[PDB]
Design a protein around this nucleic acid. Structure first.
Lengths: 99, 79, 60, 207, 63
RNA sequence: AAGGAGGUAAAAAUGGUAAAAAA
RNA sequence: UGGUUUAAUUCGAAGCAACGCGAAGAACCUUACCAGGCCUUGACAUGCUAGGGAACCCGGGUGAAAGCCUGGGGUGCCCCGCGAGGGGAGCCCUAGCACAGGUGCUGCAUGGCCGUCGUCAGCUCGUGCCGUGAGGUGUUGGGUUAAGUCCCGCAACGAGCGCAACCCCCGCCGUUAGUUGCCAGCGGUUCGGCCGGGCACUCUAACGGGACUGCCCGCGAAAGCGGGAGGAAGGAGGGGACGACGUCUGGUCAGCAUGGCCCUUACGGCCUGGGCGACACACGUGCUACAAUGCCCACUACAAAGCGAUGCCACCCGGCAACGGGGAGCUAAUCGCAAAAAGGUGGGCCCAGUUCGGAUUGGGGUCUGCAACCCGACCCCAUGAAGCCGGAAUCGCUAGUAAUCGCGGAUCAGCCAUGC
């Protein structure tokens, strides 16, 4: 009944978070819905080579943002406790939503 | 252009009402060639503002609901 | 010109249809990616400098 | 005669951003703006002792004023005082929650930005280009890379014709991905114009 | 489902050729010289920038 | 069929473009 | 774009490499071109003097706004006082003032960016030899390859940046994961994977595995070579991003910097309009056409990608439509753009400038936005032109490539988008 969404910038510390977090929940609680890979959010950018009038010959670039999902079943005191504060996502934010 | 209403300067309305309040001397010196030649302009000399000079047009009727400066050519030389 | 142009965009005029984008780290109005608030060359230089976050040297 | 940004080339796993925080579509722009202004204000009024990394860790209000500098002491203050005013200039211009960092690399001739910075410093103070710069390449190669290409373009002593100068030693495969090349560009500015200073320092494979 | 009708048809050829190669691996050894094992190598190449249709180059001038 | 060399036949519609100079 | 013209027609790029090029959103904005009205310690910044008002809300005249004279209220805070008194800063102003400003000129002053030869196959170092030495060497010699890719010869043996290669997109398989999916397993079903449940299958996204002439038959002094096998994948498996040493005194101070040079109540600012959309030609690139593989009307299905909170808007209603009114859901693989077109099934047209073609144009509505004349787009009735397949010559294209056909986005109120 707990629905947590992972909003990040890099898949690296993204899944690195997902590992311990889910396990720590499996630790201080019970069953945890494994870190589902929500379709990675990527944006499109298309600039050109230089400033001087050229239209053709270019370089393309693209935004890399990552989305995931984690759920559990019980609101254990110990789960709530640990999986609350015990965090260091540095450059990743998340969303707590209910169901 | 417009659809529900009709554009013309409000200063054109307010200044129609004055030169109508006396039937006074000629010349309307619009510093905006926009503003439709809306019905209540009768047919007086319109020295509309080009960008160069003040194109002065004696309005008729075959032009009523269709822009003022729509009558000044401005763009010199044709073909 | 150029300086007053930034003030025109800085002060934000009367009617809505008078505003225009501006690469704040170069100063240009046309083709300024209004996601980064940056021009094309502004964007390119900032990405290549190893500064632009999220984005990557696209090679799809 | 190009060279797509070797650092923008490194973007795979060979160079992390100088700004890692969450930006959610909307606030992302203003984030980039505010942050870039932080950077820019630093780069000059924080110069003094030369820095490489302009890294920042953020999320919700939290700020990480993180810097890789070539010196901490005479840039922290005679009583930890230089950190004070600067950090609070950030905080004043970015009203949230600032946290300084002056991490130091024990090697100057390692890390291309500052190497090029000194290279430009010598010529900025009107030194003989080729001699000193080539022997600076030799300094970096007295430190221990596997290659160092420090080219220098712009007006050479004036003479109108602003060419480019060839200085390098040791193999440099900027084409290769796992080469891990720190590249650093320094702006040379003479009272007779603008000259370019590019340093290319190649580190190693298997990393 | 997905992609295109005729493409779905070819995909049905592949689905069949993969369905029977499962429950009788003897048909397998003889089915390869007919090709009923290969999937594809012909997908729509990306729109190449600088040209119209991913390879179709725009017209030349010079004069 | 190798080179190298010795004597015989081949192949350019046209082209004017300067200059103290920069290392 | 060339021109010419224009009060002004902002500027730049000039074989190939300038011509749907900066510009991927010129109504006034943009804006740097013309005219007029105005402003000028200035649109900005750093600061000294004399004095003042605190700041600041607000009003008229007045006009095109820019702008200009003038008008009501007003008095937080700091140094000594239950009274009066003077001064400090936040602050706006007037005069001198240090000063700012230029999309003014020079890419023959430049960094940087990039274009190019051109994915060109080159460029080069150590040591040994050759020559009095410059320097030659390798790398000069032959097959072969996409390749200075690989083998042989050889006064050389190597090695480096490039080549390749590792990074990725993409086809087969592997581990995890389950509000997308799913009866594949079962229960029900207003019979909708809708109501329970699973993760095998679609799938979504991170760590992987897999292909190396590794093997089988023969050919070649080797490289290499033909054929064959297992394989999703055969000998470079397909596409990308990667572009050396360096030529071009290539381009750009008009994105950005930076030497000089010039101006400085104007070559600076605003505002307002006009304009960069001009038309007698020329040319470049593009669209739809001239059509019976055809167009018109009816009917039913398979897209990937991207976008979307004062945005996307389902939905119902309104109108012939444009589009508007009421009104669910979503910071989204869970709500929506969305109607794919081609296909296919049913009838017309029956070789005619044709129901082919939508150019000209008037007649009226809406929508945008302050406001649409020069200058937006969209819609409704009608006019329905040219054009019956294009010589001198020339564009691209070797495999999901030609062509055909549709879709999303960037910038955007709108849209000149047949552009990218």
């Amino acid at each position: 009944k707990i629905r947590i969404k992972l909003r990040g910038f890099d898949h690296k510390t993204l899944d690195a978070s997902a590992q311990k977090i889910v396990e720590a929940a499996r630790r201080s609680g019970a069953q945890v819905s494994g870190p589902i890979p929500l379709p990675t959010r990527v944006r499109r950018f298309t600039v050109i080579r230089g400033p001087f009038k050229h239209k053709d010959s270019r370089e393309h670039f693209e935004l890399r943002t990552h989305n995931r999902l984690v759920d559990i079943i019980n609101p254990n005191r110990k789960t709530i406790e640990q999986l609350m504060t015990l965090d260091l996502p540095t450059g990743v934010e998340i969303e707590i939503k209910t169901v | 252009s417009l659809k529900k209403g009709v554009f013309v300067d409000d200063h054109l309305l307010e200044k129609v009402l004055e030169l109508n309040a006396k039937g006074e001397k000629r010349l309307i010196k619009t510093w905006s060639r926009r503003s439709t030649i809306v019905p209540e302009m009768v047919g007086h000399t319109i020295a509309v503002y080009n960008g160069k000079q003040h194109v002065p047009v004696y309005i008729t009727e075959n032009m009523v609901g269709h822009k003022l400066g729509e009558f000044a050519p401005t763009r010199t030389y044709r073909g | 010109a150029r300086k007053a142009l930034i003030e025109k965009a800085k002060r934000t005029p009367k009617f809505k249809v008078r505003a225009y984008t501006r690469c704040v780290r170069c100063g240009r109005a046309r083709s300024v990616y209004r996601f980064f608030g940056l021009c094309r060359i502004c964007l390119r230089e900032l990405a290549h400098k190893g500064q632009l976050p999220g984005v990557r040297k696209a090679s799809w | 005669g190009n060279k797509i940004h070797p650092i923008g080339f490194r973007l795979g796993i060979t160079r992390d951003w100088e700004s890692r925080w969450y930006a959610g579509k909307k606030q992302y722009r203003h984030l980039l703006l505010e942050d870039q202004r932080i950077r820019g204000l630093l780069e000059k009024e924080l110069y003094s002792a030369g820095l490489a990394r302009v890294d920042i860790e953020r999320a919700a209000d939290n700020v990480a004023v993180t810097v890789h500098v070539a010196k901490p002491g005479v840039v922290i203050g005679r009583g930890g005082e230089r950190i004070r005013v600067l950090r609070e200039e950030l905080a004043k211009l970015t009203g949230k929650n600032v946290a300084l960092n002056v991490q130091e690399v024990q090697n100057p001739n390692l890390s291309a930005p500052l190497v090029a910075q000194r290279v430009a410093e010598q010529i900025e103070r009107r030194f003989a280009v080729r001699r000193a710069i080539k022997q600076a390449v030799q300094r970096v190669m007295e430190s221990g890379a596997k290659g160092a290409k420090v080219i220098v373009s712009g007006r050479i002593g004036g003479a109108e014709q602003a060419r480019t100068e060839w200085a390098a030693q040791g193999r440099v495969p900027l084409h290769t991905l796992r080469a891990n090349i720190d590249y650093g560009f320094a702006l040379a500015r003479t009272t007779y114009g603008v000259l370019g200073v590019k340093a290319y320092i190649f580190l190693g494979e298997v990393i | 489902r997905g992609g295109g009708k005729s493409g779905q048809i070819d995909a049905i050829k592949l689905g069949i050729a993969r369905a029977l190669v499962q429950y009788n691996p003897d048909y397998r050894a003889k089915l390869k010289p007919l090709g009923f094992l290969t999937r594809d190598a012909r997908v729509v190449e990306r729109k190449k920038y600088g040209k119209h249709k991913a390879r179709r180059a725009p017209q030349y001038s010079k004069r």
